[PDB]
Amino acid sequence: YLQEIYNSNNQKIVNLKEKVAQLEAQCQEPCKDTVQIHDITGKDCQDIANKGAKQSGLYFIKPLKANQQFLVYCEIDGSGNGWTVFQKRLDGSVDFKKNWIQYKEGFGHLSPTGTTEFWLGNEKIHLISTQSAIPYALRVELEDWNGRTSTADYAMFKVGPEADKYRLTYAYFAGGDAGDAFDGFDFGDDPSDKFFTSHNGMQFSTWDNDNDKFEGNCAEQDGSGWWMNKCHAGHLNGVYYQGGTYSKASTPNGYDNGIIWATWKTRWYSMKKTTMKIIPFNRLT
Amino acid sequence: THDSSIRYLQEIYNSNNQKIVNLKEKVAQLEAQCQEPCKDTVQIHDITGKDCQDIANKGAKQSGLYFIKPLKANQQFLVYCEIDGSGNGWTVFQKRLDGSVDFKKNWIQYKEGFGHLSPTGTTEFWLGNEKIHLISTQSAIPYALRVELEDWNGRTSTADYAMFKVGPEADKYRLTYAYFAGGDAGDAFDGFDFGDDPSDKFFTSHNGMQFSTWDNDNDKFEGNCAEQDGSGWWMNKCHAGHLNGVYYQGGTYSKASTPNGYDNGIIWATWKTRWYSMKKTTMKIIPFNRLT
Amino acid sequence: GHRP
Amino acid sequence: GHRP
Amino acid sequence: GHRP
Amino acid sequence: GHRP
Amino acid sequence: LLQKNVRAQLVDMKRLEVDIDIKIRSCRGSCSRALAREVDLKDYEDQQKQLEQV
Amino acid sequence: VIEKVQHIQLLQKNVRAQLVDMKRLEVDIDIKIRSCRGSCSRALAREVDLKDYEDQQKQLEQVIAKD
Amino acid sequence: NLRVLRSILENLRSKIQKLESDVSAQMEYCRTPCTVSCNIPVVSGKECEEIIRKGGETSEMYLIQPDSSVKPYRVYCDMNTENGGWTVIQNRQDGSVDFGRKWDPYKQGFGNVATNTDGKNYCGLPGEYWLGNDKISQLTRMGPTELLIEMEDWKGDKVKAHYGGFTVQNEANKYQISVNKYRGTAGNALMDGASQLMGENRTMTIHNGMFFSTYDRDNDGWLTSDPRKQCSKEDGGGWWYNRCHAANPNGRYYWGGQYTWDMAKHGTDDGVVWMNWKGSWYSMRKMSMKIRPFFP
Amino acid sequence: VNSNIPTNLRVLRSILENLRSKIQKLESDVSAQMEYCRTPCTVSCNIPVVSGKECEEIIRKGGETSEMYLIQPDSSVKPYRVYCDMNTENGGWTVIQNRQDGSVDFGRKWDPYKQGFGNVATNTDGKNYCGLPGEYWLGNDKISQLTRMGPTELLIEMEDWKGDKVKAHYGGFTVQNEANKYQISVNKYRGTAGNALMDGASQLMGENRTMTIHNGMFFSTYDRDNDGWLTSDPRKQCSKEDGGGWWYNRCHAANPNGRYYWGGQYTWDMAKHGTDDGVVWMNWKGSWYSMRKMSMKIRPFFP
Ligand SMILES: *[C@@H]1O[C@H](CO)[C@@H](O[C@@H]2O[C@H](CO)[C@@H](O)[C@H](O)[C@H]2NC(C)=O)[C@H](O)[C@H]1NC(C)=O
Ligand SMILES: *[C@@H]1O[C@H](CO)[C@@H](O[C@@H]2O[C@H](CO)[C@@H](O)[C@H](O)[C@H]2NC(C)=O)[C@H](O)[C@H]1NC(C)=O
Ligand SMILES: [Ca+2]
Ligand SMILES: [Ca+2]
Ligand SMILES: [Ca+2]
Ligand SMILES: [Ca+2]
Ligand SMILES: [Ca+2]
Ligand SMILES: [Ca+2]
Ligand SMILES: [Ca+2]
Ligand SMILES: [Ca+2]
Secondary structure, eight states: OOSHHHHTHHHHHHHHHHHHHHHHHHSOSOOEESOOBOSOOBSSHHHHHHTTOOSOEEEEEOOSSOSSOEEEEEEEOTTSOEEEEEEEESSSOSOOOOOHHHHHHEEEEEOTTSOOOEEEOHHHHHHHHTSSSSOEEEEEEEEOTTSOEEEEEEESOEEOOGGGTTOEEOSEEEEOTTOOGGGOOOOSSSTTHHHHTOOTTOOOBBTTBOOSSSSSOHHHHHTSOBOOSSBOSEETTSBOOTTSBOOGGGSSSSSOOBSEETTTSOTTBOOSEEEEEEEEGGGOO | OOHHHHHHHHHHHHHHHHHHHHHHHHHHHHHTTSOSOOEESOOBOSOOOSSHHHHHHTTOOSOEEEEEOOTTOSSOEEEEEEEOTTSOEEEEEEEESSSOSOOOOOHHHHHHEEEEEOTTSOSOEEEOHHHHHHHHTSSSSOEEEEEEEEOTTSOEEEEEEESOEEOOGGGTTOEEOSEEEEOTTOOGGGOOOOSSOTTHHHHTOOTTOOOBBTTBOOSSSSSOHHHHHTSOBOOSSBOSEETTSOOOTTSBOOTTTSSSSSOOSSEETTTSOTTBOOSEEEEEEEEGGGTO | OBOO | OBOO | OBOO | OBOO | OHHHHHHHHHHHHHHHHHHHHHHHHTTTTTBSOOOOOOOOOHHHHHHHHTTTOO | OOSSSTTHHHHHHHHHHHHHHHHHHHHHHHHHHHTTTTTBSOOOOOOOOOHHHHHHHHHHHTTOSOO | OOOHHHHHHHHHHHHHHHHHHHHHHHHHHTTSBOEEOOOEESOOBSSHHHHHHTTOOSOEEEEEOSOSSSOOEEEEEEOSGGGSOEEEEEEESSSOSOOOOOHHHHHHOEEOSEEOOSSOSSOOEEOSEEOOHHHHHHHHHTSOEEEEEEEEOTTSOEEEEEEEEEEEOOGGGTTOEEEEEEEESSOOHHHHOOTTOOHHHHHTTOOTTOOOBBTTBOOSSOOOSOTTOOTTGGGOSOBOOSSBOSEETTSBOOTTSBOOTTTSTTSSOOBSEEHHHHOTTBOOSEEEEEEEEOOO | OOSOSGGGOOTTTHHHHHHHHHHHHHHHHHHHHHHHTTSBOEEOOOEESOOBSSHHHHHHTTOOSOEEEEEOSOSSSOOEEEEEEOSGGGSOEEEEEEESSSOSOOOOOHHHHHHOEEOSEEOOTTOSSOOEEOSEEOOHHHHHHHHHSSOEEEEEEEEOTTSOEEEEEEEEEEEOOGGGTTOEEEEEEEESSOOHHHHOOTTOOHHHHHTTOOTTOOOBBTTBOOSSOOOSOTTOOHHHHHOSOBOOSSBOSEETTSBOOTTSBOOTTTSTTSSOOBSEEHHHHOSSBOOSEEEEEEEEOOO
16 A cells, blocks of 8 residues: 555565576576587597497597597498598588688588588598508499489598699499499590599599699589599589489580489489498408 | 352342341331421410419419410410419510510501510510400409519519500500509609600600500600600600610610610610610509409 | 590 | 600 | 776 | 323 | 655666566577567656656 | 353342442431431431442443343 | 655556566576587688688688697687688677676686578577687687777677787686787777776776686776675676776677666676777677787 | 453452441441430420411511411411411411421321421521421311311422522412312412423323323322322332322322432432432423422412
């Protein structure tokens, strides 16, 4: 009434100040980030599995020659095999027309769930692949626009230092249904076609760093960074074409520039998904 | 009368008649000795196979001559196989050791082969291009090339190349390898930086060069490298590794000796100066897994 | 592809 | 050799 | 603010 | 020769 | 003097609302969401001038 | 009394034939020695001297036209 | 007739009720946390300037490893402003994070470095955060470091304070700050104190040279015994308070800008202040501090 | 007034002393030869890298020098050795028979004649290949198989002891197989030696001439009478008497496989059986002249 209603609300308050204090304590922690990095490290993703990692995802590895560690995406099969993934395409969300520097350091994003496209860099691929005498094997996994998949393994896969332009080299094709595109393809226009499209032994090129065997510039004309040779038969850093089928008309300079593997599909067909991952070779049989 | 004589004459006459009958059985023994031809030291082994490693796989334990028939081939042909103690069988397609064969030959001769094959490896020759093409592209099993060199002091050095292959004649027996796999002879196939021109090294490299001869020029020179150096090779304006060059005794030679002025010796720039010609050369291939 |  |  |  |  | 105190509690109340608004907005960084709300001060301004007159 | 006419006048006949056997045998040997060259480490160098054979035969005809 | 009081108090009693209800709703929402999904950029380096050299052209969350001793940690890199390569150290823009924390949180770093951009699978938007005096110290002691401080008022005007040299000592030296080589348009609050003040009134507002204080760790330049009287609760944040400030980037976030002694919890200018630009009772809309390696 | 100079005729003993001395020279000569045959001759014939079906194909493949090559006429068969004459009349000639020094005996039987015998080639002075042909018979089977692959010409060359040379070219030559006794067929004669194979000896008339014709005859060897001399006395065979295996008739106008007389001229009293068993080509020099060289070469012809 008089002095009444005054000390009602005027009493709620002290108690209100205290609810507030509970609210404040409920509001100190940051949003919870669904992406986490595991704490097992090693020379590479196989080494991480041998150490008990039991799950695909993000880990840090530190190759023998590296003088700083780095985040990789490991594929842990429940079989005890740890694959280090260095390349991944699955939607055309990342632009792969990048320059030398970007190909050397890496671009794209690493995701726990592997739903992220990326190019680990060239330098990294180099440090892992040559850190010891234990030969590595490269496995390419491809997927068409009809859910079919195929693979191609290469044995003794190595990427050279920057002084040699991150030259690719392998001892031999180890089989797979995808077919040996790194061996070059007979497009049938000239007797030298197969040799001019092979990859084994090629230096890496980008538009700004031509090391191809073409008078012109394969990476500039196809829009990617790849181990080019006048120019290619296997091209996974190609332009992402929705649908698979594409035509010369859709291309920017008139040459096939999609994500091809000419020994599995035609060069006028671009893959749906692409993975390039490595594992110490003894892991295969 | 002197009949005592008519005596000794019949004596003598009958003796020489018996001497004759026996002499004749002795000529008959002689004649049977003189029916065989001269022994030839060169024999050809009986094992066969795709290539020499295949031969070696089948238990062949010795170097020498054997016939092979690559999958692509439609007629077997003779080759010289070098088999080591450890089971490797190399297929030798080139050899130089004294200057007895003239390597200045025409396209046809380089394609079919010229020189001689010996049980002992003591002969010069070029297996031909067509054969080196059929052996090295017969199956997806990649071959490696091994180049062996020997200087005039007894020194030897080597150079290996992986996934070595020779193209068909449609593509002029184009040479190709994936990469240099090492060796102390160095990688002359990669071109050499001889001097000042900045484009030296590009123009003297050999990976991807078509083969050339005096009469079938496929080089990267407005002139005729092979005709100028007198050899058959995978020329590029012109070369830095040239094992089919002119054979010069004692190794050292100079532009004066040369006929056009350019270095036309058995050279391997990354190992010795282009003005020094090798004593011996060997070119030979093996399935690359034999070195993995 | 190739470069004809 | 090289040919300039 | 300064403390006066 | 011949033989008669 | 009673005006006095409503004086004080008036202030006490004006700061509290202001503190609650800073605290609720500071939950946009931790909780699934923060309540959208606006502090209407004038109601307080007006409301305290009206205690001046007196 | 003549036992030695018909005895010689015939022994000469046989030496004539021995002479032809010998020259032929000489010739066959030469041919068979030379064909050892294609077989043996070496062949004996030798020439047939057949003049010595023709003179000797002539010197035997002389002897005939007597009886 | 002078019963316009009740008018009052009825309010107060009503007011309280509405307060309780909002507090109540915020409590229910706090039963579940905010979440983000920050997929990490492949490219990394020791600080955001090495990342832009290495091709990371976009402003977003990165991992940096200023040093092999230390574990890589997350940071927002601004690659657009002034040629990029700026590592964000502090950022205010929406009130989402409480900066009134104790020493420990100021040492460790608190808040949200980044958040998801409307569609996208990376966090391209910075959140409000404090990187952590330890990290700040170590980044500033790697070599000469410049400091960029940017602010925006509630009408969109914006100013900047650029500091050609910036260093933060380590914990033992209580994060003592040093700044120099000023240029900009907000004024030089850090080195000269408050342009509004005169004489020593101004110099007691200089930050250059001060130690860091928190409400649970008084290192301020106010030598006095009343524990209540410490620059740091009477001002909200963790800062290089002197006696007490000309700038308070870590103050409380007042919605709207203009505030008053009677809105402030303890009656002082505890908002996101930069006295030389808008004086004491104006809290900025945006405020941030970025650093970048300098030259030699 | 009786036995006049009978003493005088002891110009015998002169003789017979000799014969006795000659028989001893001959016994050491055979004995020294027999000791030399304790060790065979040897060659080292490194093999030319180029090969083909026969010398014609090899010259087309770049094989410009005359030497021993390995040919494989047909894949049924195993590659075998042959001497290839790459200089005469355009080259590409496969030598089938070669006589030039007497170093090989041609008096052999059916078998050796069937398989081939003698030396294909020998090492030239200081060289590491066999550039000089030896004396050989390639082999009737192999000659047959070469002549039936296709039209084949025949080139016969010979040279006398004084350096003169002549030749007989036959544009058609075919030799049937063993079942047909290697019967021979030759046509399209040309050259300067005369046409001994087709026309028989020019020194003879009427049926004598015709009995020396070779064309159409079967092969004979001394252990295998196929001659055209119908007769029952076994000693009376063409090949037992004129010494080689040949396409004898009754018996020959040419005898390239006959006996090598050193120096060329020989007489009936030098021959084993008193016949013309030398290396003979009646049409050019008669029957008592033996060639210093004689060879037989062949080459695919045109269609
Ligand atoms: C520092 O603050 C003083 C305060 O004394 C400013 O002026 C004085 O304000 C005080 C408030 O506490 C008043 O009581 C006086 O009216 C002012 N003092 C005098 C001396 O009149 C002054 O502006 C500041 N000091 C200087 C040097 O400017
Ligand atoms: C054919 O050859 C015979 C020789 O065997 C020759 O026939 C006659 O030979 C007998 C002796 O057997 C003699 O009657 C004649 O003198 C031979 N004729 C001549 C001239 O040789 C036959 O005459 C020969 N015909 C020819 C021209 O060769
Ligand atoms: Ca082709
Ligand atoms: Ca190029
Ligand atoms: Ca150069
Ligand atoms: Ca040219
Ligand atoms: Ca607080
Ligand atoms: Ca204090
Ligand atoms: Ca005999
Ligand atoms: Ca008869």
